[PDB]
Amino acid sequence: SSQIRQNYSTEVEAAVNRLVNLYLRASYTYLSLGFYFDRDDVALCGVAHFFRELAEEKREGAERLLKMQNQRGGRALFQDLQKPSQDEWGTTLDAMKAAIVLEKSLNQALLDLHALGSAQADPHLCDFLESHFLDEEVKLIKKMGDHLTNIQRLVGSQAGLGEYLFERLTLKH
Amino acid sequence: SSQIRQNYSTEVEAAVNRLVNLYLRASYTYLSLGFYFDRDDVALCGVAHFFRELAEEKREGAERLLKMQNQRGGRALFQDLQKPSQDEWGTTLDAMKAAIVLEKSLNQALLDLHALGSAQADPHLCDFLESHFLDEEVKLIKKMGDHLTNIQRLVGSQAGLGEYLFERLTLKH
Amino acid sequence: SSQIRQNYSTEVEAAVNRLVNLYLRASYTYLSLGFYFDRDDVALCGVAHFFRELAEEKREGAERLLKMQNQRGGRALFQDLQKPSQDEWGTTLDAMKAAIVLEKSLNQALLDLHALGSAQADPHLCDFLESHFLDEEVKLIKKMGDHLTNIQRLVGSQAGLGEYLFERLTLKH
Amino acid sequence: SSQIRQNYSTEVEAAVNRLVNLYLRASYTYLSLGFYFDRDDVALCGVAHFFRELAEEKREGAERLLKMQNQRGGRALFQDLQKPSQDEWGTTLDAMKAAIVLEKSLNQALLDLHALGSAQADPHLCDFLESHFLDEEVKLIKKMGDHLTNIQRLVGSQAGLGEYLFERLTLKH
Amino acid sequence: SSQIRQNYSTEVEAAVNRLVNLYLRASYTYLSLGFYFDRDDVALCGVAHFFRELAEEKREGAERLLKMQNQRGGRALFQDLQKPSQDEWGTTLDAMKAAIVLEKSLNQALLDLHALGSAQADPHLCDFLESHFLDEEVKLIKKMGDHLTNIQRLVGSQAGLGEYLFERLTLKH
Amino acid sequence: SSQIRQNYSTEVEAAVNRLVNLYLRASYTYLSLGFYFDRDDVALCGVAHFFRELAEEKREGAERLLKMQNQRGGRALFQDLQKPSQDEWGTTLDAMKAAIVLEKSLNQALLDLHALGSAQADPHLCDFLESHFLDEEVKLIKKMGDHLTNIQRLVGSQAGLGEYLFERLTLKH
Ligand SMILES: [Ru+3]
Ligand SMILES: [Ru+3]
Ligand SMILES: [Ru+3]
Ligand SMILES: [Ru+3]
Ligand SMILES: [Ru+3]
Ligand SMILES: [Ru+3]
Ligand SMILES: [Ru+3]
Ligand SMILES: [Ru+3]
Ligand SMILES: [Ru+3]
Ligand SMILES: [Ru+3]
Ligand SMILES: [Ru+3]
Ligand SMILES: [Ru+3]
Ligand SMILES: [Ru+3]
Ligand SMILES: [Ru+3]
Ligand SMILES: [Ru+3]
Ligand SMILES: [Ru+3]
Ligand SMILES: [Ru+3]
Ligand SMILES: [Ru+3]
Ligand SMILES: [Ru+3]
Ligand SMILES: [Ru+3]
Ligand SMILES: [Ru+3]
Ligand SMILES: [Ru+3]
Ligand SMILES: [Ru+3]
Ligand SMILES: [Ru+3]
């Protein structure tokens, strides 16, 4: 087929489609996190908003990947989105630990795709990742680490008070 | 458990969760439609944007349902999102026919949920659907029917020309 | 000689000069295309303007390459610019096909230069191409593919009407 | 052919095409001059900008000629553009002397074309040249003569100092 | 330890710390240059300001490297800053020659770090350098070469006059 | 030498150079403190900013001293800057204690220099210190004492919570 496709391997095309799925899955996980913290029996508004905003960011990442797939002459292929790994997400610390784990997996997927692009001598792909994804992900993971540290400092032996304060004073809504 | 839940049946709670899944599935279908019409070998910008905007609307419908689930003291439960029914969506007519089919199924789900709420004497639910979903869906289905009619009129024996004109003159981007 | 040159191979320097020539040749081709579509017996104003704007963009690409050649301490060397491959460019479809061919050749030259820079461990060059040329070229080729598709859809068995409509409704002046 | 052509000789048509080539060649020469004076080992910013601006003006002259060729129903025909006569342009004095030589040749070409138009009783052509080219060229040649005089006065036996001062105090960037 | 560190080698971490030291050392050298040209018996205000502004830029480079070191989960380690290589910096030409030497050493350190990152498959690092350091350094070295050329042209056999003029007419304060 | 120097002893000149070194060393210490509190495993943004701002203030103190050294006809002489006394700075209390110690040493150096100036009957120096340094330092040491007191009050037996609160409610970023 393609009238525009140039220097775009089938391997990169398929890996782009898989990364789309991983970003949409991450978005869905964040949607679940966001609504869990909005429960009347959890009620941590700032935490909810933090995860809700991440759901939006990850959907935007997927949409940028899809746009690029079309710009390169590849074909978007969608698969099922697996529901999130938990139905209830525990404390803010549990949730932030789960978020960092999820982000490290996305980062590793970005790094794996970058390596594939280098192997395939696909500099456009390499640039696209560098310019829209790699630093954004490093910044986000740093912010989550900063949060985890502050959450952990606040646990002590008065965990409720610390969880309230973090939400009130770090994650202002 | 719940400290707030009142007049909120387990049957409605589960049906709300199922409707969330149907809205998110519809959003995903529209995301696929949107990107298909952005392909270099399809290239109907107005069609793409129409479906992309619908993806956003259906995600917003899901988020309103999730918000209400929490307001009522129910518990959001997420399931897999099944990938869309096609990988390639054919002509604008094929796509708009598929969209109307999808919307009629969502509408029927709304009507089924409303009937459950009436059976359960849950007026809050009934009002919520009436006020945010039932008329929005009737308006959308009317707009899709209007489109289908105009698309069909334009086919004739010069289908390419008609498809271009519809996109240019009805769905301005 | 150079008091500033550092990590800048003679091979990259010469390839930069050759790419300048290819960009200026592309500019010249577009100048010819632009004036052909302004002929009284062709008279497709939007087509003319599309190619005229491309002539300007390709000259700007050449000037950025020349600026960089001086920033690196290389020496600009100019060669003849070969006149464009045709004197008359046929239909809008013929012209857009010729434009995509030309752009794919420029893209391949960019990719070849990038590969040379990688081989020579010249990251400044690699970055320069990634940042000002590779994505610009992918975007342009995608836009030309989108056009070609719409042009092709409009041919049918009423080619004049389709050519007029494309110019009027896609390439507004 | 032409449905519009009137009082437009084949001789004038061909001479217009040749003048286009001479203007584009002059533009190219100025592009080379502009980049030479931007070299780290030349570094005369004002000189560079003077020639860069002339490159633009000469391209604009060519484009006006091409527009007129189409207005008259003639057919643009492009030939190769011969690379500029030097790769390195010497001092500002050498360059300005080369520029005046180039401009006198363009002027003589304008005058020769005007004479052809008079011989062919083509007043539109005569007016076009008078109104957009002849006085512009006389003004430019006067400005170059004024520069040459000031450059020459500044040589004396401190040539570097004089070259710096001219660039700083006459050709402010 | 680190809860965020991912794909960040100990080799890159240590080299980042060494580059910080090189940037801070360069800042210190520029601070010394700046104050030397502010001496009553040197009194070249524009030269002073040029070097003072470079001191600030190099400190900012160090601070960006330190910020990135923390974003990646590395640990900043500081060492002594060696005092600048001279106490008195000679003429503006001597100083600008010393500045270009210093900058070429920084550039080579950037290029060496980039090569390490490529060897370690660390694209974030590679991108960080490309995006904030490599082109900034090429631009700065080009500007210093342009200055050196103008300074050299002005020496002749009236060195005082040329030094005054360069400061007055190129480096306006 | 000096054409301007008047009433400026070699003893004061050398002591000014030593104080410059002490201010630059203090700046460097604060740079290290600032980045330590920006670590993902420390993550006290307000603390970081407090020390980062002090790094800037101490560099400015050094630059004022250097400016004055030139105004008086003295000669700036730079020495090595010894790296900061620690690589890791402990808690906010540890850091603020270290900061007060550092500031008391700077203050004592100011007082020692003032005494030298009085001994040398150098009223300009005395005024310069009084007007730009002595009260600034007293104000800063008072602010650090106020902080130390609040930090100490917050330790109690819930040290993490107190450290978070101080950063959030006293050192707002
Ligand atoms: Ru809220
Ligand atoms: Ru890469
Ligand atoms: Ru982009
Ligand atoms: Ru809120
Ligand atoms: Ru569009
Ligand atoms: Ru009802
Ligand atoms: Ru409502
Ligand atoms: Ru559009
Ligand atoms: Ru027009
Ligand atoms: Ru590369
Ligand atoms: Ru750039
Ligand atoms: Ru027009
Ligand atoms: Ru310039
Ligand atoms: Ru005449
Ligand atoms: Ru006119
Ligand atoms: Ru300039
Ligand atoms: Ru000054
Ligand atoms: Ru690289
Ligand atoms: Ru950045
Ligand atoms: Ru000044
Ligand atoms: Ru901060
Ligand atoms: Ru006193
Ligand atoms: Ru003062
Ligand atoms: Ru902050």
From Swiss-Prot, chains A, B, C, D, E, F:
Organism (species): Equus caballus
Quick one: where's region Catalytic site for iron oxidation? Answer: 53-60
Annotated PROSITE patterns: FERRITIN_1, FERRITIN_2, FERRITIN_LIKE
Name-wise, this protein is Ferritin light chain
* Subcellular compartments: Cytoplasmic vesicle, Autophagosome; Cytoplasm; Autolysosome
Positions carrying N-acetylserine: 1
Residues forming the Ferritin-like diiron domain are 6-155
Q: Where does Fe cation bind?
A: 53, 56-57, 60, 63
Q: What is the lineage of its organism?
A: Eukaryota, Metazoa, Chordata, Craniata, Vertebrata
The subunit structure is: Oligomer of 24 subunits. There are two types of subunits: L (light) chain and H (heavy) chain. The major chain can be light or heavy, depending on the species and tissue type. The functional molecule forms a roughly spherical shell with a diameter of 12 nm and contains a central cavity into which the insoluble mineral iron core is deposited. Interacts with NCOA4.
Q: Which InterPro entries match?
A: Ferritin, Ferritin-like, Ferritin-like_diiron, Ferritin-like_SF, Ferritin_CS, Ferritin_DPS_dom
Task: Name the family.
Answer: Belongs to the ferritin family.
What is the purpose of this protein?
Answer: Stores iron in a soluble, non-toxic, readily available form. Important for iron homeostasis. Iron is taken up in the ferrous form and deposited as ferric hydroxides after oxidation. Also plays a role in delivery of iron to cells. Mediates iron uptake in capsule cells of the developing kidney. Delivery to lysosomes by the cargo receptor NCOA4 for autophagic degradation and release or iron.
Q: Name one GO cellular component term.
A: cytoplasm
Cross-referenced Pfam families: Ferritin
Swiss-Prot/TrEMBL keywords? Acetylation, Cytoplasm, Cytoplasmic vesicle, Iron, Iron storage, Lysosome, Metal-binding
